[PDB]
């Protein structure tokens, strides 16, 4: 059930590019990013 981290970091980048880094605060992004990583587990 292992997906390469680099591939996950690409996907996160896709998500930033869609939404825009200026559309959320940094902690909003950081909490979501942890959620993003746990959801691959």
């Amino acid at each position: 059930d292992k997906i390469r981290m680099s591939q996950k970091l690409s996907c996160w980048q896709h998500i930033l590019t869609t939404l825009g880094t200026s559309s959320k605060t940094e902690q909003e992004w950081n909490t979501f990013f942890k959620g993003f990583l746990e959801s691959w587990r």
């Binding site: 690409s10 996907c11 896709h14 869609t18 939404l19 979501f32």
Partner: protein, 64 residues
Amino acid sequence: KPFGVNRGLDLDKILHCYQMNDDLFMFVTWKGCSSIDAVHINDIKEAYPLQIIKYFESLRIIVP
């Protein structure tokens, strides 16, 4: 270089999804390509509705 629908490729598999408030992203593969892309659900709704519905059917819908 392009990712998502902009690759102009046909949807292969939907591997996974992630919800962010009201935004739902799907993690997908395309036919003929090895990469995994995050695609907003709005970007694939109208092109692939039955594949998306079948993906949701495969999930366990449960309580609490």
